[PDB]
Amino acid sequence: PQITLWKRPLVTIKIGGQLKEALLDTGADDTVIEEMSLPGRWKPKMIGGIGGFIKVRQYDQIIIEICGHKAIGTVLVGPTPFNVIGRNLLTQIGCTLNF
Amino acid sequence: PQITLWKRPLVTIKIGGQLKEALLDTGADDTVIEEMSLPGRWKPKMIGGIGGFIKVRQYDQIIIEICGHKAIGTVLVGPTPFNVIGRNLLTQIGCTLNF
Ligand SMILES: Cc1c(O)cccc1C(=O)N[C@@H](Cc1ccccc1)[C@H](O)C(=O)N1CSC(C)(C)[C@H]1C(=O)NC(C)(C)C
């Protein structure tokens, strides 16, 4: 599809059997989701942006459904103010910036 | 043009006659740039990022060029990990997300 940027590009995603609203974010290297339960092992990580850093849990090979597109990748879980779909997953659904 | 997201969407911008590197950021509502000198009066502005809210200086109607595309709008100046070109300017250059 073609999403204009007049407003926040929010989309519904399916992850860990749950449905959530997430921001299609080209500025994010990683995909960060609010506290939730995920299968598999994990390791600590610190990520930083505007406002500083937060500690999150890195889970790998996590499947996510985005607007009908199934993508697999690393997902960081932690106290993020907003759920963001990063480049590691945007590439998998073939998302690009155009102008 | 069409920009893929395998690597950070870093582009060259021009503000105040100087060239700088910035990130095309669909997850940012505003354009935030590192400390620099801009003309005119500024207003206070609080923006919320991954690590919390921070105070920045808001300058309006600032002339800025993004990858050759001219734009004139609000630019926020403050402590940021990258100079980020947010939605307020991405829309001015007709940038959209596609997949
Ligand atoms: C700058 C800004 C505004 O002026 C207004 C609203 C949100 C943001 C903002 O920081 N947006 C963020 C995403 C976000 C929104 C709400 C809560 C948390 C995060 C972003 O587009 C991004 O990926 N950024 C901005 S700074 C960055 C380039 C390092 C990168 C980043 O934080 N990346 C990680 C999430 C991977 C840390």
Say if CB B22 and CB B10 are below 8 A apart. Answer: yes
- Compute CA distances A76 → A46, A83, A92, B45, whole Å: 10, 10, 17, 29
Q: Which SS3 state, helix, strand or coil, does residue A84 take?
A: strand
- Report resolution (Å) to 1 decimal: 2.0
Q: Partners of A32 in the beta sheet?
A: A76, A84
Domains of chain A by residue range = 1-99
> Which of B31, B36, B78, B98 has its CA nearest to residue A27?
B31
Gaps in chain B (C to N over 2.5 angstroms) fall after: none
> Which of A96, A89, A73 has its CA nearest to residue A22?
A89
> Which of B32, B38, B73, B72 has its CA nearest to residue B56?
B32
- B46 in contact with A, Cβ within 8 Å: no
- Compute CA distances B99 → A23, A55, A73, B5, B10, whole Å: 15, 31, 18, 12, 20
Q: What is the DSSP letter of B99?
A: -
**Domain B1-99 = CATH 3.30.360.10:** no
Residue holding tokens 């993508």?
Answer: A71
Query: Which residues touch B41 (CB under 8 Å, ≥6 apart)?
Result: none
Cα gap B34→B15, rounded to integer Å = 12
Residue holding tokens 């935030």?
Answer: B32
Look up residue A22 and give its two tokens: 């997430």
Question: Where would I find the beta strands (DSSP E) of A1-99?
Answer: 2-3, 10-15, 18-24, 32-33, 42-49, 52-66, 69-77, 84-85, 96-98
Q: Is the dihedral of CA B76, A88, A23, B26 positive or negative?
A: positive
Query: Which residues touch B17 (CB under 8 Å, ≥6 apart)?
Result: none
Å from B18 to nearest chain A CA? 22
Closest residue in chain A to residue B49, using alpha carbons only: A50
- Compute CA distances A70 → A25, A57, A92, B76, B88, whole Å: 17, 22, 8, 36, 30
A93/B99 Cβ within 8 A:
yes
Atom number, ligand 1, closest to the C-alpha of residue A27: 23
